[PDB]
């Protein structure tokens, strides 16, 4: 009716979700900005949308609060550096966590993201993807039952008819 997404919770559940979001954002901001935690709690108390890409918003209203925040913009650049490391971690998510082999990557009907999603369940080769079932590949929401069935059938056909070019 409003056209926008809704979430329903209790009042104590709202306080628990606010405390969990506060703790998670405080840990993330302390890991990414290298500051103290006692000041971080008092800063995230008044902070709306506590710490995620808030430099585009006017940070001059934070100067109305106590304390100085002159060097923190440079820490934002450090966050970008951490983001690059995070991007390298995303490359690790491509590579370190069971990267697919050349047989699985060059399979027709599958992209790089689909091959990564299939190989994230322990598979590495096209034969390992053929060993998996439709119900085993159904654990990943990116692949559907018909698409997992077609991929399993294609991998089984590549394994069985591999003698023919």
């Amino acid at each position: 009716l409003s056209g926008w997404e809704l979430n329903v919770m209790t009042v104590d559940d709202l306080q628990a979700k606010h405390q969990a979001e506060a703790h998670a954002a405080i840990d993330t901001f302390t890991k990414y900005l290298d500051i103290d935690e006692d000041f971080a709690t008092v800063l995230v108390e008044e902070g709306f949308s506590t710490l995620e890409e808030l430099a585009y918003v006017p940070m001059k209203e934070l100067l109305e609060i106590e304390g100085l925040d002159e060097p923190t913009v440079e820490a934002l650049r450090e966050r970008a550096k951490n983001a690059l490391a995070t991007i390298a971690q995303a490359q690790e998510e491509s590579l370190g966590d069971n990267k697919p082999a050349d047989d699985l990557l060059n399979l027709e009907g599958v992209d790089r993201d689909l091959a990564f999603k299939l190989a994230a369940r322990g598979v590495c080769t096209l034969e390992d993807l053929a060993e998996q079932g439709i119900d085993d590949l159904a654990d990943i929401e990116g692949l559907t039952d018909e698409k997992a069935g077609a991929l399993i059938m294609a991998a089984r056909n590549i394994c069985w008819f591999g003698d023919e070019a």
Partner: protein, 54 residues
């Protein structure tokens, strides 16, 4: 629902569908070792002559 329907279809036709698994193929081989099912037969639809309606 009946193994007669499994005997009506070929094993190659079942192997061309990914609904069966690798362990399911071994179980199908263990079932077909008794040669009572999956012997590559063809029925009318369900019924043989001994399977008559009375």
């Amino acid at each position: 629902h009946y193994i007669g329907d499994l005997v009506q279809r070929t094993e190659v036709e079942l192997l061309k569908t990914p609904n069966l698994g690798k362990k399911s193929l071994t179980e199908i081989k263990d079932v077909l070792a008794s040669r009572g099912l999956s012997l590559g037969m063809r029925l009318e639809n369900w019924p043989p002559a001994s399977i008559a309606d009375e």
